[PDB]
């Protein structure tokens, strides 16, 4: 299962998660070619656990608001330590209204 969502800051590492999302979305092509602008607040994170009685940490999930090509998107990213490559884009859509 998973833990609870909590706010995180939007430093360079979080910006890089946004760049990852836009790179991944560009491979899929639904929105044409997008140019990363910025990740804005709020950014959210939760812990992912193995689905068994030990409940150890398996990875993390992120929810971001990302500007690309001056339009606002919502991107969800998972980090899963069991399987390489560890980051996967789960969701990328919009444009959405500002938070």
């Amino acid at each position: 299962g998973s833990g609870e969502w909590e706010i995180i800051d939007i430093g360079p590492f979080t910006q890089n998660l946004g760049k990852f999302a836009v790179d991944e979305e560009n491979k899929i092509g639904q929105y044409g070619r997008l140019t990363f602008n910025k990740v804005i607040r709020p950014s959210m994170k939760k812990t992912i656990y193995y689905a068994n009685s030990r409940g150890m940490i398996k990875g993390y999930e992120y929810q971001l608001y990302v500007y690309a090509s001056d339009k606002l998107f919502r991107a969800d990213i998972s980090e899963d330590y069991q399987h390489y490559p560890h980051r996967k884009l789960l969701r990328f859509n919009g444009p959405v209204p500002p938070p």
Partner: protein
């Protein structure tokens, strides 16, 4: 007590090199870090240099330097590993995964300059295509184990037996039975130990900045199983 023991009184740089072949799947790994046997402490980072590792990282932890074990003062006469340095020792294992395939490893552990180097060849066979190992069904974590050691006077070295417990994603546990033989490379005298064991704790982690398939290891190893001060009871 050995001459080789003086080589581990401070922090020692470590290099690890592995070439593997599991069910035909060839791969290579490089690792680097340091060890501080005063505290039984190892810090290492491994990178697969051939792309994606075809087996789970946890399966290779025991293969990737027991000379960094902390031996208590009253047990220093039983530290074979340091006594073999700097010429070093050969470490051979068979690792049998219960209801699956097996690894066979031969490694040389020795100083090259100031660096302690572990160079490994590994061959795995008889693995199931969607078993826990080729199927990548192991949790990315590690348990604490004891390594049980006895002298092997015949070969002027030691042998060890232990069973690794690998957490499986479905909640089960995969056993990996380890049989190990170590023998010195040189022909200086070595220390042949009484029965004892190494108590080992390991933490696995990831480098958030690393794009390669990789493993970060923090380990603590402490020798145990021989009582302290027995003599004084009879005085």
């Amino acid at each position: 007590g050995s001459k080789g023991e003086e080589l581990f009184t401070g922090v020692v740089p470590i290099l690890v090199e592995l070439d593997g072949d599991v069910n035909g799947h060839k791969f290579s790994v490089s690792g680097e870090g340091e060890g501080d046997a005063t505290y039984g402490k190892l810090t290492l980072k491994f990178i697969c240099t051939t792309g994606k590792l075809p087996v789970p990282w946890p399966t290779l932890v025991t293969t990737f330097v027991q000379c960094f074990s902390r031996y208590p003062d009253h047990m220093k006469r039983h530290d074979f590993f340091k006594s073999a340095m700097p010429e070093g020792y050969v470490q051979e294992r068979t690792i049998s995964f219960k209801d699956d395939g097996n690894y066979k490893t031969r490694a040389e552990v020795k100083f090259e300059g100031d660096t302690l180097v572990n160079r490994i060849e590994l061959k795995g066979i008889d693995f199931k295509e969607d078993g826990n190992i080729l199927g990548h069904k192991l949790e990315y974590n590690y348990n604490s184990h004891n390594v049980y050691i006895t002298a092997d006077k015949q070969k002027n070295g030691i042998k060890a037996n232990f069973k690794i417990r690998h957490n499986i994603e479905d909640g089960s546990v995969q056993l990996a039975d380890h049989y190990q033989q170590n023998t010195p490379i040189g022909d200086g005298p070595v220390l042949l130990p009484d029965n004892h064991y190494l108590s080992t704790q390991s933490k696995l982690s990831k480098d958030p900045n690393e794009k390669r398939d990789h493993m970060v290891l923090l380990e603590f190893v402490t020798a145990a199983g021989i009582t302290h001060g027995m003599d004084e009871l009879y005085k």
